[PDB]
Amino acid sequence: TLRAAVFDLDGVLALPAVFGVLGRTEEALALPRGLLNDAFQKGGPEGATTRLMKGEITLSQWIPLMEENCRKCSETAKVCLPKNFSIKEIFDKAISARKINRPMLQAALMLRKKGFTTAILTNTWLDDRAERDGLAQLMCELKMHFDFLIESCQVGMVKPEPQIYKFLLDTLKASPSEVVFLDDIGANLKPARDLGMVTILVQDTDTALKELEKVTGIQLLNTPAPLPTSCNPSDMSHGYVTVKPRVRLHFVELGSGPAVCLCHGFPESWYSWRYQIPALAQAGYRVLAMDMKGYGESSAPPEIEEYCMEVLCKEMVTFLDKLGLSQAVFIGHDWGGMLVWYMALFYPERVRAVASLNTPFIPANPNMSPLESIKANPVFDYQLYFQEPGVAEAELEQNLSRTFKSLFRASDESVLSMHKVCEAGGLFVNSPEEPSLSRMVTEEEIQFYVQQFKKSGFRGPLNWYRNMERNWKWACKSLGRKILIPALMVTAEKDFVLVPQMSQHMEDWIPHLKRGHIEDCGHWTQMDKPTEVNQILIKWLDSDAR
Amino acid sequence: TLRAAVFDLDGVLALPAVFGVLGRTEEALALPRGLLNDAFQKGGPEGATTRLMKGEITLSQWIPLMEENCRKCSETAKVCLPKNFSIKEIFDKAISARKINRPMLQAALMLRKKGFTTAILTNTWLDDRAERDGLAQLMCELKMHFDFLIESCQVGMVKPEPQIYKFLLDTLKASPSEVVFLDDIGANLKPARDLGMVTILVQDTDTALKELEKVTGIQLLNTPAPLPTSCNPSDMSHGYVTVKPRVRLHFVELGSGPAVCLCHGFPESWYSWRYQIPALAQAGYRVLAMDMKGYGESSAPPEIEEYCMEVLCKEMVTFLDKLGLSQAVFIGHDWGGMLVWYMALFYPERVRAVASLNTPFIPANPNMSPLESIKANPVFDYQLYFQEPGVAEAELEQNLSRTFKSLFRASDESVLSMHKVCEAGGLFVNSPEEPSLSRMVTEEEIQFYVQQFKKSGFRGPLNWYRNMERNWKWACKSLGRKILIPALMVTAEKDFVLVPQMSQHMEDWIPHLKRGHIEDCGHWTQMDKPTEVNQILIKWLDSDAR
Numbered sequence A, B: 001t002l003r004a005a006v007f008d009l010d011g012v013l014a015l016p017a018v019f020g021v022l023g024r025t026e027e028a029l030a031l032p033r034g035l036l037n038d039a040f041q042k043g044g045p046e047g048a049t050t051r052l053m054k055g056e057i058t059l060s061q062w063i064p065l066m067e068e069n070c071r072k073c074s075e076t077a078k079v080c081l082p083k084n085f086s087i088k089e090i091f092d093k094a095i096s097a098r099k100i101n102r103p104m105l106q107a108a109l110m111l112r113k114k115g116f117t118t119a120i121l122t123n124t125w126l127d128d129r130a131e132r133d134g135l136a137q138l139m140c141e142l143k144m145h146f147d148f149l150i151e152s153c154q155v156g157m158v159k160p161e162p163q164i165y166k167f168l169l170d171t172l173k174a175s176p177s178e179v180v181f182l183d184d185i186g187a188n189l190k191p192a193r194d195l196g197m198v199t200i201l202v203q204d205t206d207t208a209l210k211e212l213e214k215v216t217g218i219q220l221l222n223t224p225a226p227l228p229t230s231c232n233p234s235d236m237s238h239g240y241v242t243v244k245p246r247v248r249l250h251f252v253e254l255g256s257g258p259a260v261c262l263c264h265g266f267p268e269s270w271y272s273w274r275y276q277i278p279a280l281a282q283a284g285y286r287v288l289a290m291d292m293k294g295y296g297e298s299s300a301p302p303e304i305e306e307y308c309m310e311v312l313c314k315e316m317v318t319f320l321d322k323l324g325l326s327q328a329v330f331i332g333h334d335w336g337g338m339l340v341w342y343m344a345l346f347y348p349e350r351v352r353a354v355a356s357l358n359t360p361f362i363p364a365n366p367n368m369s370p371l372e373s374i375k376a377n378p379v380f381d382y383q384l385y386f387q388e389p390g391v392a393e394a395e396l397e398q399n400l401s402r403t404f405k406s407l408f409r410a411s412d413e414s415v416l417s418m419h420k421v422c423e424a425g426g427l428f429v430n431s432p433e434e435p436s437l438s439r440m441v442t443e444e445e446i447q448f449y450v451q452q453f454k455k456s457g458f459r460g461p462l463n464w465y466r467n468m469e470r471n472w473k474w475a476c477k478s479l480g481r482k483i484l485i486p487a488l489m490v491t492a493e494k495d496f497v498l499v500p501q502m503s504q505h506m507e508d509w510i511p512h513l514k515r516g517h518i519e520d521c522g523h524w525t526q527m528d529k530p531t532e533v534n535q536i537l538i539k540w541l542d543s544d545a546r
């Protein structure tokens, strides 16, 4: 039975094949057919290209040797190369033009999810060109999705040499009949076949995938749309900043570019952004996914007053100070969405751009106390259950697995009703002991939340709801202001607590506000509709935040 | 006795005073004298500017109100404002033109070093302009050097209102006669004077500093050149990446921009770059200062083989992978300098640019084993003392404070002689029990190194010297290569182990190599000559790395 799938890079995982630019160049310049391909392979094993692929020389050292080979071939063919001929120019264009073959990567990702060991085996070079970063970025994006990356220039061996296949088998810890090997070069498939490996000659992706699906017996073509890449906690960069003597903030960090600070809601974690972190980094941003104060690896002091909006925002500013960041784009959800609007109102010089998922911006009413506002707004009735220190803590902390399984549900999964919480005496009074697992999460993901909440529990998180009056007084100071920095409001159709219509008057205070809207999306936006969230955020980031 | 020094921002810590652009604009446009200054202060406490300074409105909300005031004033003066008149344009130019008054900051830094509590008290605004980042950057750089930053727009009070001075006294926890208050606005000094504070009216910095020096009795003018800003470990962002099951890498992170990975030598720490970290971040770079494998908070496995160049470089690549970084500029010193040359040779696609302090690049001799090379090169004799597992560990671990105090010396401080180490049986046989403290370090800095080395000791660090043959075999694979990416070699005149002449043939292998050279500098480059190191690195980074 097959248990490993091996992919070539050029012409298989990446297209157009850099190799194929030689052919296109010949035709575009009306040079003899095969002239450039012949100069490329000149000398075979003893040649310049083999030395390059084995790692003996770098790509910049190879270019002049390739030029001499082109000159030799043209002389023998009795043709002239045009005056502006440049191997560097041809290869820069070719490499930069080459992109990930998304359907091939999708198939590799599927096989890996089904228990296959996956690997990339490629004849590649040491790239020291001024423009090498483009290739480095491509290799980075691709390689993360595989168990092994075997580069000829690193192992000092090349396909079609037999030792590289023995090397591949050794790294896979697999016998040849357990391996499917995909390559676009028939000569490079032959040694894999000779050992008894299943081989696929890749021309068009579709036929290659049909052959692959048939041999593995796993559906790879016409598959449902896959979810965005998630995060494995143990594989992330974990950052820690002390903002004040007793308070430290934890964050996960990925990517390069403008800083994007992700602020989760109640009762969540940095992990609620798992589907956003890889996509935003890939989009050219430096992501900082927070464990907000009271959560996960961040400090959780007991005092209610430590969780008022004024102190929480102050600490986020210190956070930027300590990291040496003059600004960051702030993206928040739920309680984090409330915090991000306040960062825009109080610290606009530190906020590159602001985006909120579900949480609307509603100015404080100076003529009505928060108790009175809730009296006039019964949808927020349950928040009075969160008020008394210890009551909601005891219910939420009783059974952690039941807590997360009850809360984290899609709109059609019998979501907890927030109406009647006070009348009924708790969040879960009409909830089962052993809730079913929502399609949004795996059991493992639930256990991650359970493990995180074992450290500090629900006290610090519930404290975010315990500063109504303090937050109201501070918010009233900002009543004459308007939010004039770049801003995005993302509404979720089926969030019954943070309803889209609650955001309807936002333009009065944020005139240049941009909007996004997600259909059939409940409260847990990021995991409910990850693909849609990613598309809305990236589009807005690229146009408005930079 | 005075114990607190308070500085205004505009016209005091920062110049030219944004305030003074109103005067220059009047003259440049030949408008009536004081016209723009009069429209700026129109309405006094009830006016638009006071509302802006108290934080009632933002800078973008204020601009049109300032325009109306200019129109009113010009109408009363019977003049016309030119057609292209723009308050936004005037203020963008003014704010961006304003820089830190370096001699004033130097004086504040000196007073703070001498035990003074320092603070910035400023009438400022909430900046929501598209170009707000410039001001945010300025505030960031300035504020880090002070105990308190009190901004009028944040406290809802302004100078010259008496409550702000009472607020200042409260935050300082000081009585008025213990405070020196510096301002360029005489009206804003008056309430401080009225309370009994020492006040200085700032016109030209020099006279202001003479008055300040006289009153504090502390030399502030004509002072020796100060050292660059250092790092306080508890104030940094600490990052941790797991590169493989048993190996985690710790790093300190500061700033935004291109990633600059700093790689220390033997037997050091991330902290050896303390004078480089703030300066490089300020220069527009994202600094990642490593605890190399075997050191500080990074893992220290016992196996010799874990410290060969091939595995160390592989782990640094994984480090970039896990952080989502396609590249980084690699700057190394001593053992880190050796590692960075190997990163350039083996992973050029991941190395933006490469710089080494003291460590030359010398290709492996394939016709001579490392033992033989050392036999032909007696300056490296002492390295044979490092070979036997446990011998050098016992001597270096016996007394940690003596170890660091003996090693970390400037060129004129009776530096340990590396000649005769084998003959004599140890590094410190002719060294005192209680070495004097080098001028390069404080006692506290020594104790930081002592505390770091208590965790894993000297085994993992000494293991870097225990892979001569393994490193030689791997280096021989790169013999046909040349380093063609941007490269900088920095030599130190008085390093008697990594001597400048050892780098003389580097151009044969690194044709486009750029150089730096530091006179009267010993082995401990970063702390020996921090100002010079910073200038060389920044100049090279800005021209060659981006």
Ligand SMILES: OCCSc1nc2ccccc2[nH]1
Pocket: A265, A266, A267, A334, A335, A338, A359, A407, A497
């Ligand atoms: O204003 C943002 C907080 S609203 C809110 N988010 C929740 C998540 C879970 C249960 C009740 C909640 N109420």
Ligand SMILES: OCCSc1nc2ccccc2[nH]1
Pocket: B265, B266, B267, B334, B335, B338, B359, B407, B497
């Ligand atoms: O090739 C880089 C290592 S050379 C070297 N660095 C040292 C620091 C302290 C003592 C001996 C040393 N030898």
